[model samples]
Target: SSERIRYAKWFLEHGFNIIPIDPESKKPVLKEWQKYSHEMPSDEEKQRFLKMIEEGYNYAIPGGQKGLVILDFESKEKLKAWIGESALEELCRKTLCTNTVHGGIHIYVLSNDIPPHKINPLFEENGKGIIDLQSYNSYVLGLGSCVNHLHCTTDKCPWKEQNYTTCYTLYNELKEISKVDLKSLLRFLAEKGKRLGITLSKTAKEWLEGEELRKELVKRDSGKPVEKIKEEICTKSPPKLIKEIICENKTYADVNIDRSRGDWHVILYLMKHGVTDPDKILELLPRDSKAKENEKWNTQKYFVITLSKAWSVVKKYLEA
Candidate 1:
């Protein structure tokens, strides 16, 4: 019943595309469900499952069996070394030659073109290799497991509580033995997915780019605490000087001669007063938040917004 209720909510939240699959018949109530969303239930539903068999496609029914062989790499370092710039693209290419499903490498070939019923069981059994690209749902469900964000970083398999590494290594074996071009293989596996649809508009591309930038920042700032960087900015530049710059685009002395926490605190205090955009604040600062790994001052969003006016106050003493 909870499964049914959750399914219903999923349908509503993402739009009515996924259907409950019948366990007995291994068929989906809605045919070709992979064309819509990328979520699967943790467990099978009981009731309405049997009667629902009469309609749609049966995934377990022989020829309907199609799917992508997922290659999950345990470490980000290994992934970068193996896949390079076109990892996802290469996977898609590989799936096409295999011709098992439509969404091909995009959906990971758990079900192939199989009916809805068959998809769930495979998901349950082999959910181990599943990686977290991004989950529009929740961060708990973001990666392959339900634990914390740290699990995806290394050899830790928090979902199964297993110590493991090298999902990509396994994937490499599958590819080498199969001897298929990655692109063609992905297409082969993604048969039904293409028919269902895939939209790659400019906006989507930009969103992906932004995600890449965020990942780069995370990698660069790996060991450093996010707060330490904020503090450094605060001390280097306090509030009153920052306020004068924002209010007039020029620094003035004695603006924060008496104020503690200086320009950084005050700017944030005043900005919260009216303005909301973080980028605009960054425009006034000298530091850049876009740095590479082990690089300095690669991120400025916080520095500008947090220290713009506050920085000015610090500058009074430092510059004077």
Candidate 2:
């Protein structure tokens, strides 16, 4: 049997839901993956799925399948920085973990009680795009899957040599160590903004209100296209001089600059002009393959700080 089939069988035995994904793009091959989201495949269906895998298709497990969630980190160093050495050591010791193809880490846990959501890296002011809490409709590539030239291998899996802890147990443990109350998190951002001398706009204040409200707002806003969000925010927001200042930061002329960084420039221009809603700002930022791999420039913290510094530079120009 092929290694893909063997891995699929192993995942099935462990109660994971599987779906075939395109090898090149790492996106689902199935038109309606929700059909397989909650139900385990029959032997016949498994055989068909395995056939696709044999043909170079990858596989992924939707989050919240059998109460599973994977904590995806950009790197071990960032994970340790976010969770501390003691907690990091405990997590590696307890969970079913693996090294991602891009030299990152994934910690798998089974928690029926914890809703599927993401706790992103805005908590760490200088941290990059480091943490992701994947659950619910979110999906992760299964072990032995490959995307491009990168293959997910069990030989390097963190759990290969360690005792595995249930997701619930690890979730409970991490609650005290890494999880922060919503109010505390918001307060942290408020203080950080103050330190940066950037006052939170009215919309930003609404965006950071009670957790439930913020989640609802984020979900509503997330459905809109990035271009649509950008258009709405930038329509009457910033003047031409602000755009010129943003473009000036990167190059002598903005005609043929790096598009990804140019996107950041536009985003910062909007924020300085009072378009401070996080979701809208985030959407306007580039999320392409290059941006995802560029660790130095692809963080929420980096976006905020860069904009703050840019505002300081442009404010002088504006006042003069």
Candidate 3:
């Protein structure tokens, strides 16, 4: 009990929410895990978890509300592929990273922003997207033994195998969880978009704008209660706003009463057409009779400001 409590207490002391995992199946041991996404465990709850841990139950830690982001890599090579070979070792040395029981790497970082949500069709390097930025409702398992586990990917993997079981040992046990500028970090990821083949849709722009996270809302026609994110680029049926405004007769200007609907709303709608450049975004914006009623014809500089603000509205409306 003490052995597992030490690990559990470390997470608790740092203010992260903890959940029990079924060691054999490698999944959450309890239902109602989503509540743990936003709430911390009370003393009574923690006492129960430690009792469960003593009974050989493993632990998994949640991210979003904790201001943490778990950068889960299928293999270290995929992580090295994203941020360079030399940088990987340096990164793990500084962060609270551990080699997963199944040979994956989980590097934990403290993000001031970038709440726990993921983009559809993950950030790819070539045709494969091996890295998962797990935040929001997502979680990663802790340093505990797995019933049927494989050798971890690291050269000198800390865990020694025995009887078809293994433990998740740390790369750096005593290091601090590094606080990061999550927006800048993702921008660095997005910067490699041309070479990495990462698509730049509205979500990419939303990430660029720095308000990509909705703490309460998960944007789904059926916002699934499950924590698992759909990894591929699934075809999404358009929401109500897209159907009413763009696909039909109404212009952005037509909705621009009291300057409320304004330029960014126009730009946010145009993001669907894959127009990234400022001049092009302005070109697509309407200048109808309703447009003439307004004061600002919308300059290039104004479009830049509105587009940034549009991303904030992007999450607000998409979730609403």
Candidate 4:
């Protein structure tokens, strides 16, 4: 939604500027060094740009419930029109509902606390990409960058007008077949691609299966049962698999940490059976009382949920 773009502009103007900061020196670039001077080394120039990139990287509120919103509207024009007719509160509600149906949602928050990487994958399963404010800006402003990042990735942005009618048609068709109203659009994507048998990677193929993680997803796209999915996975499977399937591709596990340790153990257990995000994995774990401590573990240590548990939780909701 254009509202997010407005928020990003506000962030750019107030929170931080895309300035260069030398990682090694850990200092902002000198004023004179910022100008395009002939004497400046190309490598130094590259470093300056890299620093700006680093500065631009932001995410949701770390350890805080508050976060930013990222939405995929049909176009800047439609978003602008909607913004005019509605107040901020109404805008958010409408956008949230629209995004949920489309299989994505925007995050909303202040820039100081959260970074983009943390919550992007939550919206766009497996979190393989980032929610770039500048990229969004290009779409809204119409001058800076292309709406689709010059077709770099096949993600919806505020500027690009996607075929929502057709998309919803597909959505309804799948809902009828699956008998489940999938909240996560990624589930729709997985099922849609399942027919193609498109194998991008092992983990990706698992995600495309979309059959493994239906139990944990919200059914109504209400976003009310967010914690239910989290808790269900924590109890049924190691968090690593859930993270892998959700965060996609990357696996971050620290066996020494409590959260990572349990998930790592579970992944090893799943490997023995050559199943990832399998529905049966939940049978191996203790009950909900044992899983109640996961929120605490998430707060203290960063670990991923196992793919096996991820399947158990999301399979029903996605596959029905």
Candidate 5:
């Protein structure tokens, strides 16, 4: 009972907007949480709130009120799959992570300038069912609450040692990565794929070269005179090489170091030219990566099959 008071005060000290909730059902005790969402409680007000805590009330923090976003994973396996990838793990490593009484995990990170939004199935598989994302106009049961008669404990918290960092820390990390122009993003993806030990498929290679060839066609159609188009095409001869390779039925899988770069260039290039559907992008680059170990290591497919995955993440931010 006294522990909840201390916990609520600690949350206040850390700048979390606090409120009292029904201990058993975990619903807010007050009908209007919005009244308290934007302001911190006063010393006297906090004491009043804690009085309710002692009377079997729990604590909660209003989401997006203080730039907070909680990533709620419904199961341990779902949490593992999310943080298993190096890119995502690095982004989430320093936030305040907690284990829910119902055996879920809550990863706290800042929204920074981004508005509160939710992504269901944060992963493509949807194996974890719904992921509750709490941001603007939402609230979550806070750190010290008890649910289902079991106290929320930090004693066995897996990421407790990492402690809590500012939400902007993670937000900035994501910001920097998502800003790279299309070419650079593709190059980075290729490098990331190489590090993960995944190789491109044969169709992926052909599609990449086809993209370069398509780029050349666009330039020719830009109302330039035929002689001017030929002059420009000759100046950048790789388009010719790409055409020759495609005509010879030769795959660029092994020969092209820049194939991934070209693949992304094409995709973005097409997007710019109005090919906006994710399905169309997939159709253009139909071949995906295969994990070295029986194709089960889908993490390796981050660049190939998951190009759409990466796009889904970046597109949200870009539009935001």
Candidate 6:
């Protein structure tokens, strides 16, 4: 009777597991609906569902559908900051990204996993933490307008208009979900993430630790707890001296060339210490970056030039 039944047809027809949800508080309406988890509704079965759904029943998709993983970020900014803009660009390009009622982002990723990768929150980098890994034996409320004017959504939901609708309303041609390797994603943050001051979590045991590599990392830690190591790693910032120099440049640090030598060292310091790839080094910049280059130097062409200049300048120091 409601529009949700029509909205679910595309998903229902395409062999997805569907669970009828309450339009308001998440209580048992149809009785033990979770008993129907993993039960793909057939053509006739789908008909029975329509009658059941007619009473304003929203729907749900069970998580951990043969290795499906949902990376829920608390907000769009946290998602971008945690994954980097380019990674987000790629996800937007080819992934099942859903916007939540609370202004968050849901990234659906298929992993080569099963009952193993349960719901858990992953690490924090640059003070941003993703919500959690929503996986199997659990479920997420499926697509529908969360029109709960009678109750919860009034106080909790941020997007009042959007909360009255579904996440699909805010999409371009980004309809289909693409396959991205999970271990590669985990290893990516473990390896390259270190250059940007990420202290790897030992949770991804196999991805980050081989017999050889694990020992090197263990030795690299010098026997401190990984927590402490992260604490130390996170402290890498612009030098106090540099901050003072920038302060001396009239506090509007970017405008004043009077401190170009000190301001330039910001790039130089990161160049010498961070990722070998100059382009990636920009990703490693301080979260509170203050410099003219950042505002106008959108193109990496200039950074490449700066890197070339560093290649010459640092080469002398390296040789000496």
Query: Candidate 5, which segments miss by more than 4 Å at Cα?
Result: 1-3, 40-43, 85-93, 116-124, 149-320
TM-score of 4: 0.24
Clashing pairs in 2: 110-167
Question: Cα lDDT of all candidates, in order?
Answer: 0.29, 0.50, 0.57, 0.30, 0.46, 0.50
Please say which candidate is ahead in lDDT: 3 or 5: 3
State the local distance difference test value for candidate 4. 0.30
Residue-pair clash count for candidate 2 = 1
Best by lDDT: 3
Judging by TM-score against the true structure, name the best candidate.
3
Model 1: ten consecutive residues of lowest lDDT: 137-146
Alpha carbon lDDT of residue 66, candidate 2? 49
Q: What's the ranking of the predictions by lDDT, best on top?
A: 3, 2, 6, 5, 4, 1
TM-score of each: 0.19, 0.44, 0.56, 0.24, 0.42, 0.51
- Model 2 C-alpha lDDT versus the unseen true structure: 0.50
Indicate the residue-level lDDT of 287 in model 4. Answer: 30
Candidate 6: regions farther than 4 A off: 1-6, 27-42, 115-117, 124-129, 147-150, 153-170, 189-320
lDDT of 3 at 45: 81
The candidate with the higher lDDT, 4 or 6, is 6
- lDDT digits (tens) for residues 1-320 of candidate 2: 25456666667666466898886665788876743533334567677777787787878776644456566665666555555677656666665666665557677776523332334432233433344555544666766664333333444444443444211112122221122233443454356445534333343344346245335434433355555644554565443433343322323144454544454445445544444455565544444413333576465455545444334333332332
lDDT of 6 at 277: 45
> In angstroms, how far off is 241's CA in candidate 1?
76
Could you tell me how far off, in angstroms, the CA of residue 220 lies in candidate 5 after the best superposition? 49
Error of 5 at 12 (Å): 0.9
